Structure formats: structure tokens, C-alpha cells
Amino acid sequence: MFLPPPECPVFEPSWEEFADPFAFIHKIRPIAEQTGICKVRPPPDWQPPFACDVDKLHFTPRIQRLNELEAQTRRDYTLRTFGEMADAFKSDYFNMPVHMVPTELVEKEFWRLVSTIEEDVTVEYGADIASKEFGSGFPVRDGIKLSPEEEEYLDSGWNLNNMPVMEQSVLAHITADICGMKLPWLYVGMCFSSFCWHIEDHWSYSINYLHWGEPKTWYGVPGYAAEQLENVMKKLAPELFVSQPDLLHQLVTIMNPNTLMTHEVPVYRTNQCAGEFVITFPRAYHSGFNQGFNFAEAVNFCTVDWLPLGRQCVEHYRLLHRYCVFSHDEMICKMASKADVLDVVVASTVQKDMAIMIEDEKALRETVRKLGVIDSERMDFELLPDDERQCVKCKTTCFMSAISCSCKPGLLVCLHHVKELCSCPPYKYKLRYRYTLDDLYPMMNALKLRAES
Ligand SMILES: C=CC(=O)N1CCC(n2cc(C3=Nc4c(C#N)cnn4C(=O)C3C(C)C)cn2)CC1
Ligand SMILES: [Mn+2]
Ligand SMILES: [Mn+2]
Ligand SMILES: [Zn+2]
DSSP states (O other): OOOOOOBOOEEOOOHHHHTOHHHHHHHHHHHHTTTSEEEEOOOTTOOOOOOOOTTTOEEOOEEEEOOTTOOEEOOOEEHHHHHHHHHHHHHHHHTSOGGGSOHHHHHHHHHHHHHOTTOOOEEEEEEEEOBTTBOOSSOOOOOOOOOHHHHHTTTOTTSTTTGGGSTTOTTSSOOSOOSTTTSOEEEEEOTTOEEEEEOOGGGOEEEEEEEEESOEEEEEOOGGGHHHHHHHHHHHOGGGGSOOSSSSOOEEOOOOHHHHHHTTOOOEEEEEOTTOEEEEOTTOOEEEEESSSEEEEEEEEOOGGGHHHHHHHHHHHHHHTOOOSSOHHHHHHHHHHTGGGSOHHHHHHHHHHHHHHHHHHHHHHHHHHHTTOOOEEEOOGGGSOGGGSBOTTTOOBOOSEEEEETTSTTOOBOTTOGGGSOSSOGGGEEEEESSOHHHHHHHHHHHHHHHHO
């Protein structure tokens, strides 16, 4: 038996509210952040044109076994051949035409299927970044002629290609090609294809648009309940918490939301239909499955609301010895170096994060000086490939400073792990720093000037 979680909030913005996605997301945040996910129905005439050739769009399928609590990690189809497989799979599974299968029954059956080890149901799906073989479902600039209709949606805030690069995703001004975090993912679903419980890298927001097809079913948990959920999952599937050694080696799983609810974890659900958005909030766990053949597009983003959580996240990563996707401090300093061009509310928020950064950095440098690290030299950390500037102990990506030693050339530790670098006395160590404290205060003041005008 399956008891569906309560429905998440559904928002229907007027065109005035809808015009600015960041203003709207800030408006709904008090409500939506208590549920982790929410659904947004755009104004009825906001209809970006879904147009593609099913025979030239093609992708390499991923394959999925559907067993609850079993670990998962993070051939060629055209859209047409995948759709034909997907449709025959579902109609044969239920011996029904695909749109007479009620969504409630698919949900019930999904949770039955994944709990029964007697059934070896495997499905396939597409998940990849936009590429030349498979691009965004939103119109993008390309010197193809677009209809005026498509041109109307080229610059939309809700065109997910624009959202990262706008004024207000602080992830915009990052120079480091992240790929995973400024670029949309494309999701080609079939019945029962599912995404395991996860949060986004660096606790970012995410926004997901279902271009067309049968619904996508979601489960979401608010950010405040994140550790609650992890403790429940640790108890019931400890295999998923044995630290796997890479950023590509991370273990995730399917788990019945009723199990979370039994352990007093708040869980919300929704069916996302074609033309609707789902937004996930920072540190909001989510999972779900596709009801049938469909096509979705999603992107991470970071608002000013998120900045302190991004700092908290990197602290949390350092403690799990988890790899970072980027350096949060490097992003902050990059924005400070562009203070004159920043949005003024962005500038004010970055300035507050930078004040914490500088005070933390001052204390860390005083601690390591008391350990006998005397020598120091400036170092342009941002020039180093990420794998050359990770702390040996905690894998954090260094930027503000690190400790090196002549005894272990090329190795670095962050300033929390001075004692973990090598066995040589401390006077052989060297503090490598991006900025002196005297460099840092004028950068923060530029932000204040930009903000106060
Ligand atoms: C990060 C590195 C990496 O390699 N990967 C990410 C994790 C993997 N992955 C993603 C999915 C999906 N995620 C989602 C969401 C969300 N959030 C919303 N809808 N949705 C899907 O329908 C599917 C899919 C079933 C089509 C499935 N596997 C593999 C790729
Ligand atoms: Mn099973
Ligand atoms: Mn996600
Ligand atoms: Zn460290």
C-alpha cells in the first residue's frame, strides 16, 4: 500500500508577477522553502514553441534497474525510436492505451515494483547536457532562421538557457567553465524511469521545465529536513554512505516517501505536466519518476538568497571530504573584482559574505602562524587546475590560501589541515595566499560603494 504525500504548493503567477523569475522566486520563497519543491504554471499564453525533428535528435540511453534502496551512480536511440520503445513498454506493461493509465495507478505500481525483489524491471532514459547532437528545447541563437514566435522566447527569463547568465544568478560571473552548473540538462523519460533522492551541487536552486509528454511525478523535502532525511537513509542503507572516491562515484537510491514520512520527515508530491515548471530550493532533497514518454529541461541557479548557504555547503563538503565543483571564495572574489558592473543588491549581499570570508581567513592565518608556518608567498590559485589545488585531507578546492611543503612538492592542504601535509617541521612549510588582508579590504569597499548608491 502507498499513501501519497501531501501536494506541494502550486503557483499561477499573473503576467506581471511572471515577468521577472528572480523577483517571483523571492516572493514565493517563504512558502516554497517550507516544502522544498513547488510547481509554477506560467500564464496561459506563455507557450514557448516545442519544435524538433524526432529523427535527427539522438542520444545514448542510460539503463536503470528499479529496486528500492539499491545503490545507483551519477546502443543509440533517436527521439522517435526511444518514443516507440517507451510507448510500447507502457502499453504492454498495463495492457492499456497509454493515456488511460491513471497517474495514481502508475505511482502505486512504481512503488510496488521497486519494493518487490521478485521483479527485474529495467528501463532506459536520456540524461545529458545540451550538445550538437541534442540541444535545448528552448529557442537559442544560431546563425537557423527563427520564427517571430521563437524570437519572443529567445530572451525570456524562463528560457532556461538565459536564467544562469542573467544579472541575478551569481553563478553567471564565474569564469571557470563548470559545464554542469550553467548548462541545462535534457531529460528524456519513459514510464518508471526515475531520479534518485539527491540535492544539487553546492545546494543550488534548480528549475525544471517539462516541454511535452506525460507527467513527471516528484517528491520533495524542505531544506530544513535535509539532515533528518540523511539520518533515516543512513540507518536503512548504510552502503550509500561509504565514501566513494570521486565526484563521479557518488551513490544515490530510490526510497519510498512513506518510509521518510513514517520517520517524521516532511515529504511533498506533485505531478508536473507539460508546460509546467518545478523549482527546488537550496538543500531540498527530491526524487521522482516519469509517468511515460516525455522531455524535460533543467538548470541549477544561485540567487543572492543562496550565497550564505553556498558558504555553509562548502564547509559541509570539507567535513565529508567531498570534492567541490568550484571554489565559493573564488566566485566571491571574482564578483568583488567586478563590483562596478554588479547589480546593487547583488553587491550588498556579496559584501556581507566577503566580510565573513575575510574574518574567517584572518583567524585561520593567525592559527597557522602560531603553528610555526613563517614563510609565505602569493599564489594565483585560480590558474591551477582543480585537481592541483585540492586539500590532501579534505579535498576542498583551495583559493584564499593553502599550505605547501618542500618535503612534499606539489601537495597542498587547506589551513584547517596543516598537520596533515607531511612529516617535516613547520618552518619548512609555506603559506600560499591569493590576497593579503590589505588587498581584501579595498575589494570589499568597492562592493559597499556599489551597494550604497
Ligand atoms: C551529475 C552527473 C550525472 O552524470 N548525472 C546526474 C544524475 C543522473 N540522472 C539524472 C536523472 C533524471 N533527473 C531528473 C530530475 C532532477 N533533479 C528531474 N527529472 N529528472 C529525470 O527525469 C531524470 C531521468 C530519469 C530522465 C536520471 N539519472 C545521471 C547523470
Ligand atoms: Mn524490484
Ligand atoms: Mn535535481
Ligand atoms: Zn583541508
